[PDB]
Structure 1
């Protein structure tokens, strides 16, 4: 079925992500506002209209319900705002202004890792807002993460204490994979370089228990790659060109089982890709 939602925004939409339970939808636009709808039973209830940003809001990311109703938003105004809902209302809860350029993407860490939000800014700085209770956040900034500027950040699923890894894609035409050391410092470990233009969105594939790590990354030119790592010990990623697009590709999103990829590009077209038995990704839409 189709549940069409009228955003009622004052400008073009830049992202739209529903909650973990799939009941509440939060959208962001250039109108400096974030609207959280209630799309249960195909409804439209404007639960809140959060306006705390001085610039356009790029990406929103719900948190796991294990930590409560938490929404994160990154905006062009160098400002990261975390909205937590309490007593039936959505209100500003935490404020982050550690970046000197526009924060492009926010992606919450898996709930096993705790309550960690990774932000990527256009200045090449990556900040991880670890949460330690009592309503304070500690920031472990990864300075100079990318030469020109980080565009997207995606976390690696908890795989077996816990080794925390995430993928970053910047404007330096490359993908950087990060892991924290034993002390806590985050050190670059492997560099991925196959895109001929800006890496706009890197998205890890959620793990289902398979011994294979998959990364889908889109680029400014229009190249979408599938970075498979069949052997964890080898830690070698072999890119596979999913498709060559005539325009820019903006966002890539995996399924819950990581078998269907939602490739959305600048041509105002949304394509669903499923891997065939022959190893070639074929469009479904």
Structure 2
């Protein structure tokens, strides 16, 4: 009836490719690594190096070894690697001059490719190559600041990714061989406030599925039937959600969408009739019977902030301030 919780200001978490390694990052500048087995989480190492709140973390594909990517408000991205049980920092990606808000590895087919979004208004793509053919591609995306960037599924010029800025816009970028960089292929203007997160669905059918989440308390599903055709705008539901939406995540199959924010619970959404979206599920020292405050004012984060992410093996990890790791992981059949 009355619960005493730990300092769970965890901002992000990610489950590796099998489901044996969990990583969480928080506002207290620390990254934790958990050994996942069954329904219990074993802390094994605390990674330190960031001089500010850590916003995101993302595992690389196991075919590159055990590699973790983390980004922070300190404007830096850190690449961590485990060698014979030894966790060591093996890279510093500090090209951005402002809070780095998101990081995500590309589809393995492209290689050890990292996508980065920053409040400095730019997006960087760095192919780390262990033995050293490594130059970064830097792009101006959302002058007023980029909040999130997400890769598109694999099918060089076929490489694509979506971004969401503090200018209320969603932008789609494709790689151009002749230009030697990613170019703006589309701009979408559905939202009336900060786009908190954008997610490109891995589903492989006719249309392309795209989900944008905004500070205006609405979610938009973007669709594209033919590869060069326009982009259709479709509100998830007709009316606004009670509160701010923070995150969106597509399951690796079954095309199910997981929303963080809006209602007081992580809500799932599936599409079962042409262009109709409906709820398909849901998920639910301080006693509730420092500077993180300021940085969150500028970052416009509130107390109702939460996250949720789909993972291979059909898993969904959500924020749970009561767990040992502060994260819950439920396997979820999605078809």
TM-score (norm 2): 0.78
Q: CA deviation at 1:53?
A: 0.1
Contact 1:11 1:31 in 2 (8 A): no
Unaligned runs of 5+ in 2: 283-335
Contact 2:149 2:198 in 1 (8 A): yes
Query: Aligned pair in 2 of structure 1 residues 278, 238: CA closer, same or farther (>3 Å)?
Result: closer
Partner of 1:193: 189
Q: Structure with the greater relative contact order (CA < 8 A, sep ≥ 6): 1 or 2?
A: 2
The CA RMSD over aligned residues, in Å, is: 1.7
For the residue of structure 1 that corresponds to 2:38, the secondary structure is helix
Partner of 1:242: 236
Give the distance between the partners of 1:32 and 1:258, measured in 2 at CA.
Answer: 35
Q: CA deviation at 1:259?
A: 1.8
Verify: 1:102 aligned to 2:99, yes or no.
Answer: yes
Give the distance between the partners of 1:132 and 1:25, measured in 2 at CA.
Answer: 24
Give the distance between the partners of 1:268 and 1:101, measured in 2 at CA.
Answer: 31
Give the distance between the partners of 2:262 and 2:103, measured in 1 at CA.
Answer: 21
Which residues in structure 2 correspond to 1:181-220 (within 5 Å)? Answer: 181-183=176-178, 184-208=180-204, 210-220=205-215
Contact 1:79 1:96 in 2 (8 A): yes
Verify: 1:17 aligned to 2:14, yes or no.
Answer: yes
TM-score (norm 1): 0.91
1:233 equivalent among 228, 240, 248: 228
Q: CA deviation at 1:132?
A: 2.6
Contact 1:11 1:30 in 2 (8 A): no
1:150 equivalent among 135, 146, 149: 146
Give the distance between the partners of 1:107 and 1:75, measured in 2 at CA.
Answer: 13
Verify: 1:26 aligned to 2:20, yes or no.
Answer: no
Give the distance between the partners of 1:232 and 1:96, measured in 2 at CA.
Answer: 33
Q: CA deviation at 1:281?
A: 0.8
Contact 1:216 1:226 in 2 (8 A): yes
Give the distance between the partners of 1:103 and 1:173, measured in 2 at CA.
Answer: 18
Partner of 2:82: 85
Contact 1:38 1:47 in 2 (8 A): yes
Count residues with an aligned counterpart: 274
